[PDB]
Design a binder for this molecule. Structure first.
Ligand SMILES: N#C[C@H](Nc1ccc2c(c1)CNC2)c1cncc2ccccc12
Lengths: 156, 39
């Protein structure tokens, strides 16, 4: 069905009413979302079907129809924008300066904004509007609030 | 059975709401893709 580039909500009618379980990015004919949003299941777009192509539980990412296309990276300096698409609410850009998630394999950007679990898959942007990662995979800090990583895949 | 609805363009918004802090956290990523705090 509709394959126009842009941000999309990921919905399900299996629970009560229509529940938003996440968000995704359509670019170059490929839908990109977080693995915990779909669990690798095939999606629907009107009458058309979207089949998974690549996926990884550790990276927590999954592409549909084709290989992962998003390849931009946070420069470790500039402010970024979370295009947060919350359940039942209109898409909205929030500007923030990410922090650092320091790990045994390297440093990673981290956006400290708290939103419902259904906001998972919302893209994080650079000043050019390029997708530098997806929101929805992180940790719960001493304050109770959520701190998400800036999860980006690899473009083969 | 999951489905997708469009929610808008992916664009930078000048004069957007500027909020949130920039913390420096020590974390570990396990085999299941779940982050955890290290102290
Ligand atoms: N939904 C969801 C998130 N849980 C999660 C996040 C990452 C993974 C899994 C579950 C499975 N393994 C990878 C989640 C949990 N708590 C608060 C959140 C606030 C914003 C966005 C996602 C959140």
């Amino acid at each position: 069905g509709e394959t126009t580039d842009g941000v999309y909500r990921v919905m399900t009618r299996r629970l009560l009413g229509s529940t938003q379980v996440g968000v995704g990015v359509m670019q170059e004919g490929v839908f990109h979302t977080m693995w915990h949003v779909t669990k690798g299941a095939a999606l629907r777009s009107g009458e058309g079907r979207l089949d998974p192509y690549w996926g990884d539980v550790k990276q927590d990412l999954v592409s549909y129809c084709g290989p992962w296309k998003l390849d931009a990276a946070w420069d470790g300096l500039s402010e970024v924008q979370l295009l947060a698409v919350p359940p039942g609410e209109r898409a909205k850009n929030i500007q923030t300066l990410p922090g650092i998630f320091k790990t045994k394999d390297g440093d990673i950007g981290a956006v400290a904004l708290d939103y419902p679990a259904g906001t998972s898959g919302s893209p994080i942007l650079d000043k050019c509007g390029r997708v530098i990662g997806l929101y929805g995979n992180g940790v719960v800090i001493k304050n109770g609030s959520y701190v998400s990583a800036i999860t980006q895949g690899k473009r083969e | 059975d999951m489905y997708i609805e469009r929610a808008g363009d992916i664009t930078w918004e000048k004069d957007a709401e500027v909020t949130g802090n920039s913390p420096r956290l020590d974390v570990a990523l396990d085999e299941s893709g779940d982050f955890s705090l290290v102290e």
